[PDB]
Amino acid sequence: MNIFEMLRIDEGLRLKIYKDTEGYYTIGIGHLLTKSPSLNAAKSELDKAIGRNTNGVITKDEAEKLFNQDVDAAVRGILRNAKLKPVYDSLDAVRRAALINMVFQMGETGVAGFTNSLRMAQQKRWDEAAVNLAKSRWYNQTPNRAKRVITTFRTGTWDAYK
Ligand SMILES: [Cl-]
Ligand SMILES: [Cl-]
Numbered sequence: 001m002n003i004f005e006m007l008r009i010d011e012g013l014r015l016k017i018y019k020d021t022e023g024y025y026t027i028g029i030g031h032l033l034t035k036s037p038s039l040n041a042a043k044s045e046l047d048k049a050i051g052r053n054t055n056g057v058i059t060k061d062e063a064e065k066l067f068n069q070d071v072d073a074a075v076r077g078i079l080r081n082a083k084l085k086p087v088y089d090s091l092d093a094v095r096r097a098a099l100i101n102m103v104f105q106m107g108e109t110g111v112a113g114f115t116n117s118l119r120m121a122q123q124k125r126w127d128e129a130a131v132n133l134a135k136s137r138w139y140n141q142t143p144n145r146a147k148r149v150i151t152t153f154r155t156g157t158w159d160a161y162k
Contacts, residue, residue, distance in 0.1 A: 001158040003071060003097045007104055009161060010145050013063060017042055017056045021142055027056075028063030030104065031070060074100050077108040084112060087122050095121070098153035105145075106138065121153065130154040 011030030017039070020026045025033040025042035033045040039056075046054050050062055058066075078084045078099065088099055103111050111118075114136070120129035130150050133139065139146040151160040 001161055003100055004067075006097055006152075006158075006161060007067075007071065007101060010101065010105075010148070013060070015058055015060065015063060017046065027058060027066075029067040029070075031063075031066045070104060071100070074104045078103055081108050081112060083115070083118065084108065087118050090122050090124075092156050094156045094158060095153055098149050101149050101152075110138075126154045126156075 008029060013029050014027060017025055017027050017033070020030075020032065024035055025039065025045075027033060027046060031049075033042045033049070036042065043054070043056050046056060046058070049066060050058055078088050084099075084103075088096055091099065099111075102114075114133065117129045117132040120132060130153065133150045133153065134146070136146075139150070148160040152158065
């Protein structure tokens, strides 16, 4: 298992514009187009992203290219964040994937707010971090997904995804 397969499981794959768990226009593999209530705004965002008049539908190959970019951006966002980098550097490969998943979903800033959890993880207090991670809007809004990431983070195994 790896980051790509992991996120593909958590986000799914859609080729037509859709609304996410929060009402935002998204497409492909969890690619947020816009926070705006506007479909046109979203179509415009899609064409700009894809580089063509899409008419709100992309191809699998298109979805995969956006996904590659987003993963890449997630990692580099981590490596450039001062609070995040040191944590990431301290973790094993599986747990690092758990961190990338979170940043993919909620952004560098959102994640930078799990301060307490982050510090515990740095100290390798798996259980306490896991509990702390659970006390969040994040877990309450998307529990099953949050549950999988937290287990991965706690255990450093892919069990939750097997
Ligand atoms: Cl983009
Ligand atoms: Cl969920």
